[PDB]
Amino acid sequence: SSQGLLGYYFSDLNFQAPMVVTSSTTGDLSIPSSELENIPSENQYFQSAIWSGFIKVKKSDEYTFATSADNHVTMWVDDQEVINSNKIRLEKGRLYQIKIQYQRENPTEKGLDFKLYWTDSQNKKEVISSDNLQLPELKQKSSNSRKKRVPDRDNDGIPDSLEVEGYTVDVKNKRTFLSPWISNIHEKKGLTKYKSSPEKWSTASDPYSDFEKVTGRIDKNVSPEARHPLVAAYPIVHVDMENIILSKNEDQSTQNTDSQTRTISKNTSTSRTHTSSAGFSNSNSSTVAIDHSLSGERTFAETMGLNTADTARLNANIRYVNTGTAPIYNVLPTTSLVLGKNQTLATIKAKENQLSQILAPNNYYPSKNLAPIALNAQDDFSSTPITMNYNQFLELEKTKQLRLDTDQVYGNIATYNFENGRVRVDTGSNWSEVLPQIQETTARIIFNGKDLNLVERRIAAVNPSDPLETTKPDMTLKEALKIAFGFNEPNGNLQYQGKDITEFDFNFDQQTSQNIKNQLAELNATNIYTVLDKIKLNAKMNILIRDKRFHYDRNNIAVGADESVVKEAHREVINSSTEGLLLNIDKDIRKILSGYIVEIEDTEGLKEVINDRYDMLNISSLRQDGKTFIDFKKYNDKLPLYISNPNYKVNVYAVTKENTIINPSENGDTSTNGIKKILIFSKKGYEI
């Protein structure tokens, strides 16, 4: 579909002003004026052109080449002129470079009709077939058979002047035209204005060329935003733990293994973290919160019959999560499961080059439609038990938290092959040779607008002290947000999925903050939000952008929100009864709540707390219709609230994750006393 020659069509006579760069499958190198809808009519006159690629014969014959305009043409085969009308021997299974230049002054028609022909020795002449033509090796190295060599200093195939001045791509029939940006035309039409470095084959320093990206000659799994030359395409992987089971480790000394199941099974919630002011760290990490809610009230050790000399082990179901912009194919990264500050309990590895599927951007391994991975799998004799000694086990009970630290070892890359127009995993290309340079030459933005989860993107930006990086276009904060995260601006206001930019805060590392502060001073600007178009990003900046509605822990996970926000989010009550409340609660708000406390307040002001335990707050559930039910009966012994006097109040309180207590207090109290909570419903019995 893409094979044939690469063509440069210029409006000037001397190969200086390229109007169109496109490829054509066969020897027909024509561009009809019907396809130049995005080129001003005056510039549809092509006075010169250059095509470039390779030819391969499927039968070794003596061939004679000819074109539509031999008098305006010079053609070379392997640096030999064949046109400037003679015969030349060509061998099967060998590849020959092709260059063709064309010049015609003051053409009277628009576009170009031009065909490349050959005649074999049986004297039969034909437009050269698609199967005989290949594109140039627009790579940074030649291949064994295909060498590399109209100003194109980085050899990506986009001429220096287009990369510097701005270009657009438009999708024709089965072809993609690359052309200069022209304001009056392409702005109305809504097209994206691309700039890129004429000296960087990949301007973002990733494994896909600026040309591959914008022409779709690229791994279909690469994220849509990373098809922009200025957005880095690379994987970003963390592990998601979905649940966990603890149990006592069998023991040499106890011979009987007939005893009752004494395990502890808990759901877990895992979030990708970022530890700050933004951090400079490129590590992958996630934190796991083990559910503290009711599963009587024995200690873990009492539950499992653990004496102080015993050991326990854990199993858990997990998935890998790719929140980056490029797929992984044949190596999942290695992960440490860590307890407390640095007690590694386990090393989690998958089997290299034996992945059951690719791990795509915005996706999981295994895919959610398949079973998760179990840390100790059932069909796996050699799975290492994840063990804790007794003190570690109590530490786990008290913290109810684990950390998964995942390396950046991501294996080989699927790259485009100009010889055959296919994408295939390349054993000679590895993510480890790419990531260091991506990290060195881009600004990193971490943004949580999607669903309060941290999503990192990197955007090519100038390093003022490194002359090469100096050849990239200026990247503004505003542009960065648009191309990397899909911010748009329907009314002079930058927003993300309907939320104004000013609904998110800005945080930077120390160096970046001082940089941005200087820039605002030079702009005589006091408010970043009103000059995003003028704030310039540099390589190595780190920027953290977070929904302002919420409170964040040191990991930058949303763990709360203002009383006013939580209250307002609950104001709309569909239905209330002695059995519970039915509300409409923003999915973002539900994420920051550990549960609810229900209480009846009598006439003298005394309070009966219905679900009065730190592990009994889990009384909300999300209904099949998106509405939340708060269930009064759950810890009321399956009975609706009994209100002995209509003037009594039913109060319901929301408890946020940062106010959630996860253990009995020091003195031993398992009640809700002292828990910081937020009143969100209060009505008399007669109002219910």
Interaction site with Ca ion (CB under 5 A): 152, 154, 156, 158, 196, 200, 210
Nearer to Ca ion, 158 or 316 (CB): 158
Residue among 448, 535, 452 nearest 485 (CA)? 448
Measured over the CA atoms of residue 131, residue 132, residue 138 and residue 142, the dihedral's sign is positive
Residue nearest to Ca ion (CB): 210
669 is in an annotated binding site: no
Report, in Å, the least distance between residue 454 CB and Ca ion.
Answer: 30
200 is in an annotated binding site: yes
Report, in Å, the least distance between residue 144 CB and Ca ion.
Answer: 24
Report, in Å, the least distance between residue 472 CB and Ca ion.
Answer: 9
Report, in Å, the least distance between residue 203 CB and Ca ion.
Answer: 5
Gaps in the chain (C to N distance exceeding 2.5 A) after: 84, 149, 276, 295
244 is in an annotated binding site: no
Nearer to Ca ion, 198 or 580 (CB): 198
Nearer to Ca ion, 180 or 595 (CB): 180
Report, in Å, the least distance between residue 136 CB and Ca ion.
Answer: 12
Nearer to Ca ion, 221 or 471 (CB): 471
602 is in an annotated binding site: no
CB count within 10 Å of CB 303 equals 18
547 is in an annotated binding site: no
Nearer to Ca ion, 210 or 509 (CB): 210
Report, in Å, the least distance between residue 204 CB and Ca ion.
Answer: 10
Specify whether the CB–CB gap between 66 and 117 falls below 8 A.
Answer: yes
- For residue 656, CA distances in Å to 12, 439, 585, 593, 678 come to 67, 36, 14, 4, 8
Nearer to Ca ion, 156 or 405 (CB): 156
Question: What is the 3-class SS of 526-551, one letter each residue?
Answer: CCHHHCHHHCECCCCCEEEEEECCEE
Residues sharing a CB contact under 8 Å with residue 554, sequence separation 6 or more, in sequence order: 275, 276
Residue among 642, 587, 643, 650 nearest 620 (CA)? 587
197 is in an annotated binding site: yes
User: Sheet harboring 649-656: ordered strands across?
Assistant: 607-609, 593-601, 649-656, 678-684
199 is in an annotated binding site: no
**Amino acid letter, residue 445:** I
User: For the chain, what is the total number of helices (H) and then of strands (E)?
Assistant: 10, 41
163 is in an annotated binding site: yes
Report, in Å, the least distance between residue 535 CB and Ca ion.
Answer: 25
Residue among 539, 387, 528, 405 nearest 463 (CA)? 539
Nearer to Ca ion, 138 or 348 (CB): 138
The whole-angstrom separation of Cα 158 and Cα 449 is 35
DSSP character at residue 391: H
Cite the annotated binding site for Ca(2+) by residue number: 152, 154, 156, 158, 163, 197, 200, 210
